[PDB]
Amino acid sequence: KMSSELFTLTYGALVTQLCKDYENDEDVNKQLDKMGFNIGVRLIEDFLARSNVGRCHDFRETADVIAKVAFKMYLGITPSITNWSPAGDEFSLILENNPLVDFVELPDNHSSLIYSNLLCGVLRGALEMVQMAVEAKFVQDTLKGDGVTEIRMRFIRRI
Amino acid sequence: KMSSELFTLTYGALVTQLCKDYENDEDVNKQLDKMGFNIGVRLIEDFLARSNVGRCHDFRETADVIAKVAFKMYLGITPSITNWSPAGDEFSLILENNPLVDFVELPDNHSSLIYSNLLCGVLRGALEMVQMAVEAKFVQDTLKGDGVTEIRMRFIRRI
Numbered sequence: 001k002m003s004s005e006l007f008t009l010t011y012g013a014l015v016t017q018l019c020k021d022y023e024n025d026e027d028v029n030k031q032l033d034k035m036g037f038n039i040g041v042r043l044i045e046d047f048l049a050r051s052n053v054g055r056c057h058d059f060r061e062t063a064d065v066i067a068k069v070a071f072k073m074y075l076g077i078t079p080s081i082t083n084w085s086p087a088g089d090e091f092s093l094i095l096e097n098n099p100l101v102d103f104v105e106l107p108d109n110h111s112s113l114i115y116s117n118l119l120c121g122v123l124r125g126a127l128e129m130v131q132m133a134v135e136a137k138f139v140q141d142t143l144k145g146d147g148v149t150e151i152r153m154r155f156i157r158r159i
Numbered sequence: 160k161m162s163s164e165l166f167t168l169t170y171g172a173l174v175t176q177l178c179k180d181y182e183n184d185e186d187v188n189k190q191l192d193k194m195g196f197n198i199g200v201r202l203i204e205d206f207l208a209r210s211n212v213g214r215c216h217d218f219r220e221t222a223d224v225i226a227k228v229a230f231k232m233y234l235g236i237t238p239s240i241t242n243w244s245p246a247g248d249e250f251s252l253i254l255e256n257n258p259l260v261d262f263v264e265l266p267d268n269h270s271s272l273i274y275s276n277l278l279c280g281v282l283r284g285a286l287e288m289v290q291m292a293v294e295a296k297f298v299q300d301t302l303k304g305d306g307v308t309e310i311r312m313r314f315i316r317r318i
Contacts, residue, residue: 001160002235005205006198007169010277013194014173021180035172039165046164076161118169 004076004102011100015115025113032114036121037128043074044126057131059155063091066123066153075099079151095149098142106143114138116149123153131159163235163261170259174274184272191273195280196287202233203285216290218314222250225282225312234258238310254308257301265302273297275308282312290318 014035018028048054050073053065063081071093072078079093100116114120120136127134133156140150173194177187207213209232212224222240230252231237238252259275273279279295286293292315299309 002163002166003232004161005202006233006281007161007166009198009201010166010170010173013198013277014169014176017173017176017180017190017194021176031176035176039168039172042168043164073162074165118172122165 004099008100008102008104011118012104014118025110029112029114029117032117033121033124036118036123037125038121039118040122040125040127041129043122044129047073047126048130057158059091059132060088062127062132063093063153067093070126089155091153092139093151093153095142095151098149101143104143111144114141115143116141120151123151128159133157133159163258167259167261167263170277171263173277184269188271188273188276191276192280192283195277195282196284197280198277199281199284199286200288202281203288206232206285207289216317218250218291219247221286221291222252222312226252229285248314250312251298252310252312254301254310257308260302263302270303273300274302275300279310282310287318292316292318 015028015032018031022028022031047070051065051069053061056062067079067081077095077097077099079095081091082094083092084090098116100119104115106113106115117138120138123136124134135154135156137152138150139152140146140148142149174187174191177190181187181190206229210224210228212220215221226238226240236254236256236258238254240250241253242251243249257275259278263274265272265274276297279297282295283293294313294315296311297309298311299305299307301308
């Protein structure tokens with residue numbers, strides 16, 4: 001196990017490089033999400049090998065495992081699961097900080113950048129590989145002056 | 160604290176992006192080292208705040224702190240310190256794996272890529288900020304079929 005500061009600074013270098021390569025926040029958002037997807041498709045293999053979940057396609061069990069096991073294992077934090085839809089097909093992950101944003105305050109010119117957008121791709125890619133089509137999106141971000149960071153996750157369909 | 164697999168895959172995404180941006184292994188090596196330098200100049204502040212070292216410019220004490228505290232804290236591993244020069248101005252860090260290379264075997268066409276070159280920049284940038292000019296370079300790499308990964312560090316001058 002390792003503390004996170006070298007990880008967060010390395011992620012910072014990646015965002016910096018993408019900003020150099022695209023000079024447009026929406027393009028950066030997109031590339032972070034695509035990279036995250038590729039990471040998630042690989043990361044799920046590590047996770048399933050190390051965990052006790054096996055084969056399952058239950059959305060609530062999935063929320064619990066993501067929040068209480070995967071976030072802890074890979075980011076050192078445990079977000080809360082809140083704000084369930086009536087159908088039980090949508091939930092939020094609530095993070096007290098932004099785990100990738102220790103000490104990285106945004107320029108006012110970059111209001112549209114979703115700095116930690118990689119994480120949405122990772123969630124979507126990982127779950128695709130266990131036959132669950134989901135959408136993950138930031139709806140709050142402490143970097144933008146919100147009181148929490150919130151990732152909203154929606155179950156679309158079984159694959 | 161967090162396990163390393165999301166960190167190593169994120170670093171992988173960074174190397175991948177640089178390979179797309181440059182298509183030349185030497186250019187990638189250079190950019191990783193430059194990014195590492197920028198990271199090290201920031202990381203040293205985190206480290207000094209969290210540690211008991213204060214103000215010091217002793218090369219052997221520095222080797223010990225790097226190996227036994229900083230590597231453990233930021234990468235979850237403790238390299239050995241070996242192979243001291245007679246003058247005590249050069250030493251090696253010996254790593255049993257490549258910490259950033261879990262599951263990333265190189266193409267034969269990329270023999271010149273120093274995949275984890277970011278780490279050399281981090282070492283040099285961090286030490287510059289405590290007034291020590293050093294050179295850090297990979298001299299062995301498990302990714303290239305060597306039996307260990309070895310980073311050679313040389314003290315140049317006080318700044």
